[PDB]
């Protein structure tokens, strides 16, 4: 189809206008005094929300060039939230601030490539400065405090997470489920988590989490690329007859097969999700068998001669639950034999002895850590159902935050860390004046999040910004009760990971846009 | 009159557009390979010219805001030509270059006041560097060869000027008029020149030179302001039947009287011109008398109860010729008796001895210098009349250039002095980064005149300018013969005065425009 | 007045379009089979003409930029006719051909200045080649047959001119007027001609030859510039009641005086015409006394204390007739006594052997040649008044053609001389390729006039041009009978002067246009 | 040598190459100017004056080291900036192929909009 091609400055203002709509819509939700955004539904009452992520999902623009702008920052900003459980809105307002100033510099005739290198240098320096500014979360007392803070000062939630992490370690897998009564439950069950997500976003049945969630699923273990649906028919009919969902783990599910699965689960008929097997090559064949022994399934491998048309129910594995992310699949409470698993553990442990290198050794150690490790399950209790469901969400929110704090620590929240780190770098220079301007564009943009909060709070951003630039370490502006004196100790914090990720992703996309000279799209 | 008001960016894009039309029209004439501009005369054939001054004069624009732009730089550029005899076109292209870049910086968000200060500092430094680069014109051998160069290698013009300066000093008054035969003539006659021009254009009867030129006029010397024409008629009636022009020297000529004289002279009824008396206060009264002695006239003064209605042809002075600039009146060959002038020269010389103030003594010394010095008259000859009129214009031209050369010396022509002077100021800084941009805006602008010239030649400006920068002192690019060498030796030079004036004036108007936030004009 | 400004390509397409209308209107009249052009009057019948000059005069265009184009070449082309008595149309079609090709080259990216230099070199070479091709007109037999040819093979006109030139020399002044009967008359009378014409086109009383013609005038000879009518009044009131016209020869007649004279002669009062005196300075004073003697009047000279208010009829000179051109004044049958003129000739001849200077000798010898040469007066007779005027016009037109033929000789007519000369420069190069293209543009253009003639005759321009190029010298295409032989022998010739002038002027304006980058005119 | 310096270096070698008529000569010069385009663009993308660098490369010999990464001088191939001769040859030949066909195109037929 014939295209619409836009160049240089013309292309760049179109993008800017696009991100401006996305950012202006999203940034009003930022901070404790954030405003409501009303998102229309095709029927019934509109949704009123203060969630920047929900707002971003809906943003799509008529002008195809403007829309490209929006969808670009939208995708990298969402990556911040994927990695850290937070930061999408922050990433978005940072991106806008860099792009706005960056493009002004380009229009002045400064080199876009030098501007990007300056921005990048400033960001690299800033990330290091975040690391030094960071306070660790070692003991379970600190872990509890972070969980508590991330759940509106609910000490029950902090306690729950701390007790869960105590059972499975820092590295361990932790799951949240609906409760069965008034009081909470904590159990460690046979389970595993690997780094592969849904092969189509249309498998999602939990839009709020953006996740697939299947209860009592059957599990298909195929050592091949399933491309045509005709292999699957004997299985798919049997899964439908039994009435349970189906998770497919294989080398890949593509084209004809994936399309048929997507529309069918979308159309109600059988509940199916599909993910790639974890890893590649030989380690991939092994990991399938780990999951097979974990779930009481048989790996259908066309290498032994097994045909997928010939697989029956008994060949399928089983679990109590399965949760799938954009890039995580986790299996909860495997019906796999409580003795076949230790046989598999023994095997791998034995392979560790006869391994001939550091790599081969530690890669086998990953598998036992998964297999013998298991999965912690928190069952959230409450008085009524709505209180139970609401607390589950707060427990899932705090779990993300706490896991993020565990690995990188915490820094002063409400944006005061970004502006704090920015002031540390007032002396940073590049190779030429263009790069220098690039550095300054970043250190200004880093003030965006805070200045916004202060604007939403009906206060003068500049006056606050100054006072914040006057303090040290984690002294800053209490964005809620309007005070000053060590943010972290008074419960206003972000995991360092979320602030770092927000900044890095914003700079990533802002850099790409500043260095964009051409745009190709379809005709209106 | 209801007004049209424009602000900020809107105002200054209009202004820039206006100077763009002016500069683009004018810059094409620059250098040896300058292009033609065709100027329409509503009667007969159009004028084809390479004269940037003639082109500039015609430029007036329909959009009243754009027009303001053009008129602003037109005014300031013309002052360069007034001061130095050349440089209007150069000032214009410099102004365009500074404004274009300056506004780019303003639109980027840099402080216009700091940009101006940066430009000013760069110019002050450049003017200083220009004096260091300058080669003096001390002796009359150098005077001769600068005159020769300014008249297209005509050595006759060179030694005419040299001999004239030899007669009356380097600061003497040298005037030039039509010859009477084949041979040139040089005579020193009783005369004077003072710093007061025509009280109005429209007295201009030499549109080519922009001057008033009166043959054998009478001179009225009035020690008062002339407001109404009522007291003027008896003198006008007396001068009308005498059949000769009249120069009026008064404290001022205003409204009613001036308007009638403007109208009456432009109808052809009587050929009149009016100029303010030189200086002010008590010094004015004496200088009026000085002229009166020189010209053999009587000063009519209110002080001693003298009425203008009673002043006859007797009281009127006489001279062979008078010439009037925008800021200069020159009375040539005054009739006054030798005894009376020498007698008065003796009077002032006595007063110099008696003077009890260094300032008072200096002002007196100045008066004798004019009165005793007289005026050099160059009568220019040729074989035919058209050659005689041509050579005269080449003498006039070279005479202007020679005065400027004697005052401030000569520098490399073809705009290489400006680029050299810039190239030595690379490491010059200001208070902040905006001033630094201001400096770089000036130092890039100084390249414009050369680059333009090189463009008109159909060559790569960037290559030629680059090579010039890599040279020293008065090394450069001979645009006519495309050769690199010593500019002064090869005879491609500007008087330092014209280069300095062009730069200072360009920067003056450019700075004012950059710092403009509002414009007020009439409705279309 | 707000202006309309156009640049580069935009400017020059407008300019080209303007010359296209002019040239296309004019070129159709060229050669023996030239077409008619109809020119509309305000009233009565339109004028039908084959005269390219009459057509050119009427051409004026609505688009002010296009009009500039037309007026530019109109001006330059008319100078050819002024110089040679012919060639305006030719100059115009040459100009079109050079411009069309020149701009094509500019639009291709070739340097306009180098193109101009190439054209100029090709023309200089062509003019040189034209002199080599030229056949002289030495004796009066050749003079007769050139006159015969210029008057449509009328041998009477031929030997009239031959006899006139025999009487007054080849450089004598020959004038032609209405006859008094059937027979022609030839008389040498006291007269003069100088290179000054009418000071105002409105003095013209004979629109036919754009000439001022005065029967039995008084001649006022004033050694001064006349600005006011004041001093004229006694002389004018005296000349009015005498009932005779007045010729004023002053240093100059300006402003109020010129305006008054024009308005008065144009309607009602008195019939006057004023011209500048010839030369300048001392020679101007001298030549006035020459005219004074010839016409038997007195010079009224300011210097000796003479006033015009005191002048009388005796001071005025007298002559039978005076004719005044754009460029020439001729005084016929001076009343001044023979004894007076003899003695002035002896005066000047004494100074010839008193002054030792090759220049002063020629200047004095030129004065006696004028004074003692007189003027030949051809009175043209015929059977009918209509025939007389018709024959008179053929004499006037033939006289010009013979004067040019004496000076520079004759070359092949019908546009062969140019093709012949152009084919001899096939090897002429410049300093670069842009110059070489310029050279070819001129050589191709020199084919335009012939090619047009051939087109008018309905033959093929390419074939005919081809055959001429194969021939030598003055062999070529007989533009009427359609054969190939000696062009001069067959009587198809141009004076070399008209071909040379046509080419030089065409190239002059074409070069200027090619090198035009900007145009300024008033708003529509 | 890469960075577009091969094409420029090869075009400087052919200054004196002439054809059969003046038109073929313009055809020659069109190609020799065109061979500068790649480097000229590379330099434009880096924010340096395409004409200065072009001029500098022209006064060099063989594969003379203009650093397309850091901008400095040694030996182009030896400092790792190169193209296989095949790619530079193929690029030039195919470009000339189609450019030639387009220059000599007088008519175009397509469907109605």
Nearest Cα residue to B15 out of B75, B119, B96, B127: B96
Compute CA distances B2 → A475, B120, B523, B524, whole Å.
57, 36, 7, 10
Q: Which fold has domain A1-134+410-524?
A: GROEL; domain 1 (1.10.560)
Q: How many Å apart are CA A289 and CA A273, to the nearest integer?
A: 19
User: Contact at 8 Å (CB) between C209 and C396?
Assistant: yes
Residue of D nearest to B461 (CA): D51
Interface probe for B, chosen from A100, A108, A429, A433 (most Cβ of B below 10 Å), is A108
Residue of B nearest to C363 (CA): B383
**Considering just the CA atoms, what is the radius of gyration of chain C in Å?**
26
The answer to whether the CB atoms of A109 and B104 lie below 8 A apart is: yes
* Distant-in-sequence, close-in-space partners of B219: CB < 8 Å, separation ≥ 6: B246, B247, B249, B291, B295, B297, B316, B317, B318, B319, B322, B331
Q: Which chains touch B (3 or more CB pairs under 8 A)?
A: A, C, D
To the nearest whole angstrom, how far is the Cα of C383 from the nearest Cα of chain B? 42
How many helices and strands (H and E) does chain A possess? 18, 18
Kindly give the pairing relationship between strand C475-477 and strand C484-486.
antiparallel
* Distant-in-sequence, close-in-space partners of A486: CB < 8 Å, separation ≥ 6: A473, A474, A475
The pair of structure tokens assigned to C246 is 């007045």
Nearest Cα residue to B95 out of B512, B482, B479: B512
Beta strands in A40-85 (DSSP E): 47-49
Q: Does C359 touch chain B (CB under 8 A)?
A: yes
Beta strands in A372-425 (DSSP E): 375-380, 410-412
Q: Does A97 touch chain B (CB under 8 A)?
A: no
Compute CA distances C252 → B379, C32, C224, C275, C318, whole Å.
20, 45, 7, 7, 20
The pair of structure tokens assigned to D10 is 């090869």
Plot region of B153 (φ>0 → left; ψ -120 to 50 → alpha; else → beta): left
Kindly give the pairing relationship between strand C218-223 and strand C246-250.
parallel
Q: Which fold has domain B135-190+372-409?
A: GROEL; domain 2 (3.30.260)
Q: How many Å apart are CA B428 and CA B435, to the nearest integer?
A: 10
Compute CA distances C512 → C23, C99, C281, C432, D102, whole Å.
17, 10, 34, 20, 36
Residue of C nearest to B33 (CA): C113
Q: How many Å apart are CA B117 and CA B129, to the nearest integer?
A: 18
Maximum pairwise Cα distance, chain A: 73
Q: How many Å apart are CA C165 and CA C402, to the nearest integer?
A: 10
D5-12 helix and D85-103 helix, angle to the nearest 10 degrees: 70
User: Contact at 8 Å (CB) between A426 and A469?
Assistant: no
Kindly give the pairing relationship between strand A37-39 and strand A47-49.
antiparallel
Q: How many Å apart are CA A294 and CA A331, to the nearest integer?
A: 9
Residue of B nearest to C518 (CA): B37
Q: Does B382 touch chain C (CB under 8 A)?
A: no
Where does C384-432 have alpha helices with state H? 385-408, 416-422
Nearest Cα residue to C322 out of C420, C421, C376, C246: C246
User: Contact at 8 Å (CB) between A115 and A106?
Assistant: yes
Give the sign of the dihedral formed by CA C315, CA C321, CA C325, CA C327.
Answer: negative
* Distant-in-sequence, close-in-space partners of A126: CB < 8 Å, separation ≥ 6: A418, A421, A422, A425, A442, A446, A503
Burial (0-12, 13-18, 19+ Cβ within 10 Å), B305: exposed
Q: For residue A248, give the DSSP letter.
A: E
User: Contact at 8 Å (CB) between B185 and B177?
Assistant: no
Compute CA distances D26 → C69, C425, C441, D99, whole Å.
31, 22, 16, 15
Kindly give the pairing relationship between strand C272-276 and strand C317-324.
unpaired
The answer to whether the CB atoms of C520 and B58 lie below 8 A apart is: yes
Chain C residues with beta carbon closer than 8 angstroms to that of B388:
280
The pair of structure tokens assigned to C362 is 């020629």
Helix or strand or coil: residue B221? Answer: strand
Kindly give the pairing relationship between strand C516-522 and strand B36-39.
parallel
Q: How many Å apart are CA B203 and CA B247, to the nearest integer?
A: 11
Q: How many Å apart are CA C487 and CA C414, to the nearest integer?
A: 9
Helix or strand or coil: residue C382? Answer: coil
Q: Give the residue ranges of the annotated binding site of B.
A: 29-32, 50, 86-90, 414, 478-480, 494
Q: For residue B35, give the DSSP letter.
A: P
Helix or strand or coil: residue B414? Answer: coil
Q: How many Å apart are CA B426 and CA C376, to the nearest integer?
A: 79
Compute CA distances A36 → A26, A49, B363, C429, whole Å.
10, 5, 81, 81
User: Contact at 8 Å (CB) between B119 and B507?
Assistant: yes
* Residue C478 among known ligand-binding residues: yes
Q: How many Å apart are CA A495 and CA A137, to the nearest integer?
A: 10
Q: For residue B211, give the DSSP letter.
A: B
Q: How many Å apart are CA B379 and CA B390, to the nearest integer?
A: 13
Q: Which residue has the tokens 């710093």?
A: B195
Nearest Cα residue to C182 out of C26, C388, C42, C374: C388
Compute the residue count for chain B.
Answer: 524
The pair of structure tokens assigned to A498 is 């979320």
Q: Which residue has the tokens 């960016």?
A: B9
Interface probe for C, chosen from B20, B38, B381 (most Cβ of C below 10 Å), is B38
Nearest Cα residue to D73 out of D64, D83, D61: D64
Task: Give the up-direction half-sphere exposure of residue A421: CA atoms within 13 A in the CB hemisphere.
Answer: 27
Burial (0-12, 13-18, 19+ Cβ within 10 Å), C135: middle
Interface probe for A, chosen from B13, B102, B106, B108 (most Cβ of A below 10 Å), is B108
User: Contact at 8 Å (CB) between A518 and A6?
Assistant: yes
Q: Which residue has the tokens 């008398």?
A: B289
Distance of CA C347 to the CA centre of its chain: 34
Q: Does B109 touch chain A (CB under 8 A)?
A: yes
Identify the H or E element spanning C84.
Answer: helix C64-84
The answer to whether the CB atoms of C281 and B45 lie below 8 A apart is: no
Burial (0-12, 13-18, 19+ Cβ within 10 Å), B7: exposed
Compute the residue count for chain C.
Answer: 524
Q: How many Å apart are CA B477 and CA A278, to the nearest integer?
A: 70
Q: Does B136 touch chain C (CB under 8 A)?
A: no
Q: Give the residue ranges of the annotated binding site of D for ATP.
A: 3, 67-69, 83
User: Contact at 8 Å (CB) between C255 and C227?
Assistant: yes
Interface probe for B, chosen from C4, C5, C363 (most Cβ of B below 10 Å), is C5
Query: Chains B, C in contact: 3+ Cβ pairs under 8 A?
Result: yes
C358-371 helix and C281-295 helix, angle to the nearest 10 degrees: 20
Question: How many CB pairs (< 8 A) connect A and B?
Answer: 12
Q: For residue B41, give the DSSP letter.
A: -
Q: Does A111 touch chain D (CB under 8 A)?
A: yes
User: What angle (nearest 5°) sits at the alpha carbon of residue B336, between those of residues B334 and B340?
Assistant: 140
Q: Does B386 touch chain C (CB under 8 A)?
A: no
Q: How many Å apart are CA A141 and CA A149, to the nearest integer?
A: 13
* Residue C175 among known ligand-binding residues: no
Plot region of C296 (φ>0 → left; ψ -120 to 50 → alpha; else → beta): left
The pair of structure tokens assigned to C143 is 């003079």
Pick the CATH number of A191-371 from 3.40.1440.10, 3.10.20.30, 3.50.7.10, 3.40.50.1000: 3.50.7.10
Q: Does C75 touch chain B (CB under 8 A)?
A: yes
Q: Which residue has the tokens 């006054």?
A: B336
Q: How many Å apart are CA B443 and CA C479, to the nearest integer?
A: 66
Q: How many Å apart are CA A220 and CA A269, to the nearest integer?
A: 18
User: Contact at 8 Å (CB) between C422 and C507?
Assistant: no
Q: How many Å apart are CA C115 and CA A133, to the nearest integer?
A: 72
Q: How many Å apart are CA C94 and CA C390, to the nearest integer?
A: 31
User: Contact at 8 Å (CB) between B323 and B211?
Assistant: yes
The pair of structure tokens assigned to B463 is 């290559």
To the nearest whole angstrom, how far is the Cα of D23 from the nearest Cα of chain B? 22
Q: Residue window 396-435, chain C: list those with CB within 8 Å of chain B.
A: 434
* First and final C-alpha spacing in chain D: 46
Give the sign of the dihedral formed by CA A29, CA A34, CA A35, CA A40.
Answer: positive
Distance of CA C253 to the CA centre of its chain: 24
Where does A269-357 have alpha helices with state H? 281-295, 340-353
* Residue C414 among known ligand-binding residues: yes
User: Contact at 8 Å (CB) between A316 and A220?
Assistant: yes
* Distant-in-sequence, close-in-space partners of B265: CB < 8 Å, separation ≥ 6: B202, B203, B271, B272, B273
Q: How many Å apart are CA B33 and CA D43, to the nearest integer?
A: 30
Q: How many Å apart are CA C227 and CA C219, to the nearest integer?
A: 18
Kindly give the pairing relationship between strand A410-412 and strand A493-495.
antiparallel
User: Contact at 8 Å (CB) between B228 and B256?
Assistant: yes
Alpha-carbon dihedral B343, B346, B347, B349, rounded to 10 degrees: 160
Q: How many Å apart are CA A136 and CA A405, to the nearest integer?
A: 8
User: Contact at 8 Å (CB) between B80 and B10?
Assistant: no
Q: Torsions phi, psi of B318, nearest 5? A: -145, 145
Residue of A nearest to D44 (CA): A111
Helix or strand or coil: residue A330? Answer: strand
Kindly give the pairing relationship between strand A329-334 and strand A317-324.
antiparallel
Compute CA distances D21 → B346, C277, D18, D24, whole Å.
85, 60, 8, 5
User: Contact at 8 Å (CB) between C239 and C313?
Assistant: yes
Nearest Cα residue to A207 out of A45, A331, A39: A39
- Write the DSSP string, B362-401: HHHHHHHHHHHH-EEEEEE--SSHHHHHHHHHHHHHHHHH
* Residue C87 among known ligand-binding residues: yes
Q: How many Å apart are CA B149 and CA B400, to the nearest integer?
A: 12
Instruction: Give this entry's resolution in angstroms.
Output: 3.0
Q: Does B107 touch chain A (CB under 8 A)?
A: yes
Alpha-carbon dihedral D4, D8, D10, D11, rounded to 10 degrees: 140
How many helices and strands (H and E) does chain C possess? 18, 21
Nearest Cα residue to A440 out of A159, A5, A110, A172: A110
Q: Considering CB atoms only, which of B24, B36, B180 is closest to C516?
A: B36
Interface probe for D, chosen from B461, B466, B467, B469 (most Cβ of D below 10 Å), is B466
Nearest Cα residue to B370 out of B290, B467, B435: B290
The pair of structure tokens assigned to B375 is 């005026």
To the nearest whole angstrom, how far is the Cα of B78 from the nearest Cα of chain C? 19
User: Contact at 8 Å (CB) between A421 and A146?
Assistant: no
Chain A residues with beta carbon closer than 8 angstroms to that of B107:
104, 107-108
Compute CA distances D55 → A145, B243, B463, B468, D60, whole Å.
67, 70, 7, 15, 9
Beta-bridge partners for A274 = A248
Chain C residues with beta carbon closer than 8 angstroms to that of B67:
2
* Distant-in-sequence, close-in-space partners of B280: CB < 8 Å, separation ≥ 6: none
Q: How many Å apart are CA C109 and CA C97, to the nearest integer?
A: 19
The pair of structure tokens assigned to C181 is 């009967």
Q: How many Å apart are CA B134 and CA B318, to the nearest integer?
A: 43
Show me where the domains of chain B are located: 1-134+410-524, 135-190+372-409, 191-371
The pair of structure tokens assigned to C54 is 């009459």
Beta-bridge partners for B185 = B379
Beta strands in B190-327 (DSSP E): 191-194, 212-215, 218-226, 246-253, 272-276, 300-301, 317-324
How many helices and strands (H and E) does chain B possess? 18, 19
Residue of B nearest to C521 (CA): B40
Residue of C nearest to B380 (CA): C281
* Distant-in-sequence, close-in-space partners of A132: CB < 8 Å, separation ≥ 6: none
The answer to whether the CB atoms of D46 and A114 lie below 8 A apart is: no
């Amino acid at each position: 189809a014939a295209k619409d091609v836009k160049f240089g400055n013309d292309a760049r203002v179109k993008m800017l206008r696009g991100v401006n709509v996305l950012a202006d819509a999203v940034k009003v939700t930022l901070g404790p005094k954030g405003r409501n955004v009303v998102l229309d539904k095709s029927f019934g009452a509109p949704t009123i929300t203060k969630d920047g992520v929900s707002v971003a999902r809906e943003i799509e623009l008529e002008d195809k060039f403007e829309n490209m702008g929006a969808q670009m920052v939208k995708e990298v900003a969402s990556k911040a939230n994927d990695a850290a459980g937070d930061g999408t809105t922050t990433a978005t307002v940072l991106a806008q601030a860099i792009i706005t100033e960056g493009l002004k510099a380009v229009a002045a005739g400064m080199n876009p490539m030098d501007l990007k290198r300056g921005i990048d240098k400033a960001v690299t320096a800033a990330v290091e400065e975040l690391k030094a500014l960071s306070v660790p979360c070692s003991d379970s007392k600190a872990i509890a405090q972070v969980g508590t803070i991330s759940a509106n000062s609910d000490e029950t939630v902090g306690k729950l997470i701390a007790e869960a992490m105590d059972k499975v370690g820092k590295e361990g897998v932790i799951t949240v489920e609906d409760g069965t009564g008034l009081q909470d439950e904590l159990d460690v069950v046979e389970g595993m988590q690997f780094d592969r997500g849904y092969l189509s976003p249309y498998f999602i049945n939990k839009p709020e989490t953006g996740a697939v969630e299947l209860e009592s699923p059957f599990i298909l273990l195929a050592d091949k690329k399933i491309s045509n649906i005709r292999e699957m028919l004997p299985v798919l009919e049997a899964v439908a007859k039994a009435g349970k969902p189906l998770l497919i783990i294989a080398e890949d599910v593509e084209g004809e097969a994936l399309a048929t699965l997507v529309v069918n689960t979308m159309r109600g008929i059988v509940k199916v999700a599909a993910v790639k097997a974890p890893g590649f090559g030989d380690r991939r064949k092994a990991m399938l068998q780990d999951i097979a022994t974990l779930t009481g399934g048989t790996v259908i491998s066309e290498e032994i001669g097994m045909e997928l048309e010939k697989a029956t129910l008994e060949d399928l594995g089983q679990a109590k639950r399965v949760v799938i992310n954009k890039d995580t699949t986790t299996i909860i409470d495997g019906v796999g034999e409580e003795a076949a698993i230790q046989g598999r553990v023994a095997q791998i442990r034995q392979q560790i002895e006869e391994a001939t290198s550091d790599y081969d050794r530690e890669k086998l150690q990953e598998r036992v850590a998964k297999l013998a490790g298991g999965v912690a399950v928190i069952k959230v209790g409450a008085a009524t159902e709505v209180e139970m469901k609401e607390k589950k969400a707060r427990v899932e929110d705090a779990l993300h935050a706490t896991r993020a704090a565990v690995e990188e620590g915490v820094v002063a929240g409400g944006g005061v860390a970004l502006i704090r780190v920015a002031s540390k770098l007032a002396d940073l220079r590049g190779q030429n004046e263009d790069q220098n301007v690039g550095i300054k564009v970043a250190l200004r943009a880093m003030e965006a999040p805070l200045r916004q909060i202060v604007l939403n709070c009906g206060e003068e951003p500049s006056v606050v910004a100054n006072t914040v630039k006057g303090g040290d370490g984690n002294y800053g502006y209490n964005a809620a009760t309007e005070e000053y004196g060590n943010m972290i100790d008074m419960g206003i914090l972000d995991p360092t990971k979320v602030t770092r990720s927000a900044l890095q992703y914003a700079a990533s996309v802002a850099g790409l846009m500043i260095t964009t000279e051409c745009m190709v799209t379809d005709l209106p």
